Design a protein around this ligand. Structure first.
Ligand code: GTP
Ligand code: MG
Lengths: 192, 171
């Protein structure tokens, strides 16, 4: 699986922001209809989370975040990564206890149970979210591939030569085969 | 294969209401009872003649099943008209027309044309959605409305012609 390129990340974030803005207008328009308003809010929350997940990959591509393994040592690629952390963060680990905290602050949290518990929580949440981002990344990548097929299925089918149209027809089959895989990816995501 | 107009249409609505059968009746003049759920989209092209003008229609038939509606925003791009289909023998499919319409609002162009189709009107004794209740709804939103039978071909040609006529006059 090739990662999403920066152009792909930007194109998705742009579509999600646009969709988010439209959901907001719609909530305003249906105010008073508690069923539709509730469903629109559920959609908007979902789009917002996907946007935030794309922003993490954006930060990673621009150096505001760095990929690291479970111990917090730097790694090259996303497939190798266990967390993406900020410039000012570090991991502390011992015998299966992992802490994510601000760089230099181990002295400050060492004797503080609330800060300890927070650092463990942040580590685990960060690990799980990176797993979510990887899965969404694959879904986004696959979806962008199917989208660019539509543009192409179109002109091909426009043509009258039984060659380019019979092509379009096999392109449509392939497109639909991808939709089967995309749906199954969406299923796993929901489990995680 | 020259034309004076070129319109992109979508069919949307619940699984099993007859979107694909409407597509196949209109574009291929065929009907079959064998069924496979539409996995993503199907696409047919057909030309009609309206007010002396040749209209090439690009018709996209979408999946009713939510698990296959991953890239719907992409199907709406450049759509001139959307046909919302329900099954006249199935109340839930009609109840869901409200949500389908809200999907149009969300993904389609602001000025997109809409058409409500109640399919399977050949099933006269099985019909549970009254014509007047359907048409009152359509009318309440300025949406044209027809009842069709993909199986017997009733109103199928007329439906696409009515859609093409709505779009032609807003150009
Ligand atoms: N009696 C009658 N049955 C019909 C008519 N149209 C469709 N059906 C039946 O309804 C079934 C569903 O038709 P489809 O067009 O495949 O339904 P769909 O909306 O495309 O469903 P999905 O692809 O799952 O979204 C068909 O297999 C037919 O048996 C009709 O005009 N009359
Ligand atoms: Mg179908």
């Amino acid at each position: 699986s090739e990662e999403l390129s920066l152009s792909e990340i930007n194109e998705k974030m742009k579509a999600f922001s646009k969709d988010s803005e439209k959901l907001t207008q719609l909530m305003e328009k249906h105010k008073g209809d508690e069923k539709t308003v509730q469903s629109l809010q559920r959609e908007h929350h979902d789009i917002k989370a996907k946007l935030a997940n794309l922003q993490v990959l954006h930060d990673a591509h621009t150096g505001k975040k760095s990929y690291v393994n479970e111990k917090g040592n730097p790694v090259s690629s996303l497939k190798d990564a266990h967390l993406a952390i900020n410039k000012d963060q570090e991991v502390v680990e011992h015998k299966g206890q992992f802490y994510l905290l601000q760089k230099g602050q181990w002295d400050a949290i060492k004797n503080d149970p609330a800060a300890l518990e927070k650092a463990q929580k942040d580590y685990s949440q960060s690990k799980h979210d990176l797993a979510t981002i990887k899965m969404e990344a694959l879904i986004h990548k696959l979806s962008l591939e199917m989208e660019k097929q539509l543009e192409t299925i179109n002109d091909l089918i426009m043509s009258t030569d039984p060659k380019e149209n019979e092509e379009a027809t096999k392109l449509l089959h392939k497109h639909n085969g991808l939709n089967l895989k995309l749906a199954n990816l969406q299923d796993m995501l929901a489990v995680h | 294969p020259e034309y004076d107009y070129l319109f992109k249409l979508l069919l949307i609505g619940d699984s099993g209401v007859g979107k694909s059968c409407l597509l196949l009746r209109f574009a291929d003049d065929t009907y079959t009872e064998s069924y496979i759920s539409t996995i993503g989209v199907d696409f047919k092209i057909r030309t009609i003649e309206l007010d002396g003008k040749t209209i090439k229609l690009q018709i996209w038939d979408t999946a009713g099943q939510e698990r296959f509606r991953t890239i719907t925003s992409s199907y709406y791009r450049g759509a001139h008209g959307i046909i919302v289909v329900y099954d006249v023998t199935d109340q839930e499919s009609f109840n869901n027309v409200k949500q389908w319409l809200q999907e149009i609002d969300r993904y389609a162009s602001e000025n997109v044309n809409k058409l409500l189709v109640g399919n399977k009107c050949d099933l006269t004794t099985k019909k549970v959605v009254d014509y007047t209740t359907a048409k009152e709804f359509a009318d309440s939103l300025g949406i044209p409305f027809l009842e069709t039978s993909a199986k017997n071909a009733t109103n199928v040609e007329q439906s696409f012609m009515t859609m093409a006529a709505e779009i032609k006059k807003r150009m």
